[PDB]
Design a protein around this ligand. Sequence first.
Ligand SMILES: *Cc1c(COP(=O)(O)O)cnc(C)c1O
Ligand SMILES: *Cc1c(COP(=O)(O)O)cnc(C)c1O
Ligand SMILES: NC(=O)c1ccc(-c2ccccn2)s1
Lengths: 422, 420
Amino acid sequence: GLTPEQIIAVDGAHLWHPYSSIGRESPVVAVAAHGAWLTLIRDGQPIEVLDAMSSWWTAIHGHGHPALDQALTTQLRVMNHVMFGGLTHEPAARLAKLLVDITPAGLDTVFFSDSGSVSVEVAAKMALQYWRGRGLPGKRRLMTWRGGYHGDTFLAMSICDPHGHSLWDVLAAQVFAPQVPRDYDPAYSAAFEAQLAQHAGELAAVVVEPVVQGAGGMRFHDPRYLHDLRDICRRYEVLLIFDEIATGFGRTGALFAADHAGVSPDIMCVGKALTGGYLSLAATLCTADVAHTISAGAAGALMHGPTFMANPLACAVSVASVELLLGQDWRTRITELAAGLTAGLDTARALPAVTDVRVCGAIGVIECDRPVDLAVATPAALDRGVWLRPFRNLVYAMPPYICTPAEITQITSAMVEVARLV
Amino acid sequence: GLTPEQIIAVDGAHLWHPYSSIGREAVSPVVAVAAHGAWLTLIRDGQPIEVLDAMSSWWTAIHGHGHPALDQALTTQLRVMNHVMFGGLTHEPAARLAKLLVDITPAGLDTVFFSDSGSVSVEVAAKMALQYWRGRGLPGKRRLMTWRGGYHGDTFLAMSICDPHGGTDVLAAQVFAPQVPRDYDPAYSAAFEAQLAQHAGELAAVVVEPVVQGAGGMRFHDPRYLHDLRDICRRYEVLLIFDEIATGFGRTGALFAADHAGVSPDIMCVGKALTGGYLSLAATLCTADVAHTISAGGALMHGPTFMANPLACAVSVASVELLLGQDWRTRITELAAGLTAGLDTARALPAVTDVRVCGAIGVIECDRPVDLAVATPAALDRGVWLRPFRNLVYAMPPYICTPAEITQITSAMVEVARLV
Ligand SMILES: *Cc1c(COP(=O)(O)O)cnc(C)c1O
Ligand SMILES: *Cc1c(COP(=O)(O)O)cnc(C)c1O
Ligand SMILES: NC(=O)c1ccc(-c2ccccn2)s1
């Protein structure tokens, strides 16, 4: 049993954190999460704050949600897990159907896995094996544009932003296109196609985050670009792959950002909010064509099998979550979060340190001119009862979908002061 | 809701399986619903029959499914905190587990980087090696050296040190020594050193599974090899990485395989059996030295989303503590012993080529590929879930299995092996 002063001592000593260095920077103890609220121990005392980041994209329905909690315990009463090797089960099949149907059409197979990162490698694997089935070992490189993020595994890092993972001669060398504009310039697509053109025969795929680039720098672009990529890929026989591991499940404003242009990719990756922030789970989806080409090509299978593939607990709770999203009118509300952030953040545009304000669904961004100092911003936000984690020059929120209108006021307002704080 | 045949219908069209296909059986997956204790309830004649698991749903279920202590620890944590982001936040589960893992692991492994699966923890481990040598300003040290026979996960970095035969050349070219033999040969170790030697100034790390090679042939080898390797790495200034995602937590007879050689590695991976089989959770442990060398190159550049997931950890604490509040060594010994007897009659069968038993791990190795379409329905008729691989008929039972259940699994095994 451990006190907060014990967690803190045990933590510093023995735990890594993300982009962390044992012995530098300073985490804060969490002791409860419920609905849209955390209990952080600050100065010996428990305090209430809004999970403004949805624990990095995952708590779409907030923490401790009755439907999601129950999906778990009841699953736990029946079956906790079985190897997915030679075995199948109800949550895997329900999630799959659910996934197959609510996704960009044509995506009707489902490869389950445990993290976004792995979910990405699997997609690569499909792509590579796909063309190997099609007698084109030549196709094995990955074209993307700049500012993208796809996880911290050595292949995913490979299509992460090179001049800003992080810059590595150890990752694969991939085709990068320059950085995709916010507004629709038809000439960027032109350049993109021309680049892909010199590389077509050796490009197994093009990987992209649809409409919104998350950890790359909370950047948006015009939904008409994905239309251009679809065609470009279609006319050059290059697979198109969406990484919807951040965008997915209502976050941008539609069900998947892909749907903002009504485009369907050959391969799709989803994670983060898939289980409503309860457990690690990912999925990788591909069109029947891609799957029938793997199976039938040499090796006759997709050589990938995680130990916890299709884990019943993870699926079960995810069934709830997905169902929960679909069974309410999610569209009206994401819109209203968008409304709420837009109104609440507009004041930030008149601040000297603020370079841009952008909202897209339940995604509110304040781009500054300096990098934001977590040493000042984090207390600040905490002082105003909100969990905020700036990154680079961005002060952003990605609230749980069940935040009340006033709860979205707190969040926008706390963000504003942080920005004002320079 | 959803019936078995719907489940199968949907599964056929829409589901990928481990290293499987979409469209080609020639064995339709058997429906599970439910699964608990050392037993899984399976549907295959359109009827619910319980069978021993066997394995441990692939090393996962070391304390059984639906174990009360482990169901309660999850029950508990779920109620007060399901998950928070570990960027900027810490929680009790993480701390309690880190403390537990740091204390039970081979001496010197002092920090824990949580991730989501065995494969990620492996890649994380290599990141630790390669970032390690760059902070020593020796950036050329960026390949890996390993045994043949090995398995370390399915992501492409992990695939580059897998036994080049199973488990297309676009992976990292790594240094492969020959297969580590079963019995101790001083000559093998020296030949390993001579080889390591010539690539050592460009090797960041040796990477292996201590004592037991899991998914790559179910092979056992003599522990003093690891101790040879610890020495070989010490002298040529290459880090040692042990992959204890399979061997961890008592499965081979000691709390960790590395304890047979009585040697610590520099960096270390576990998982699989980490949560007691409930949830995907991995761990990478490295020494203060690697840790400190890392933070002076400027930090360990990896951060999964569900890092230190409070539910996966609270259950893991339950499982690790549970493991340790009982004479687990005796319990495994009996498993080894009861298994040893069990699979004995096999060695005379014409098919069988070898019979070996390490900790709670039992293998009948065969002449020919095992035609699972004969085998899987056969062991199921003996009330066991049994999934052979190539020419191997093996198992890894829950520690809660009883001498009776153990004989029931070992029987079924021998018979599948007679069935050629
Ligand atoms: C978070 C994320 C990943 C990696 O997922 P993990 O679960 O952190 O491994 C990959 N791609 C995108 C777009 C993401 O947002
Ligand atoms: C099972 C296993 C892994 C990887 O496990 P996943 O979580 O399935 O990636 C790695 N190494 C060894 C030795 C294993 O047994
Ligand atoms: N999740 C699973 O059921 C499995 C993961 C890996 C499996 C495996 C891996 C190698 C050989 C035989 N089975 S089975």
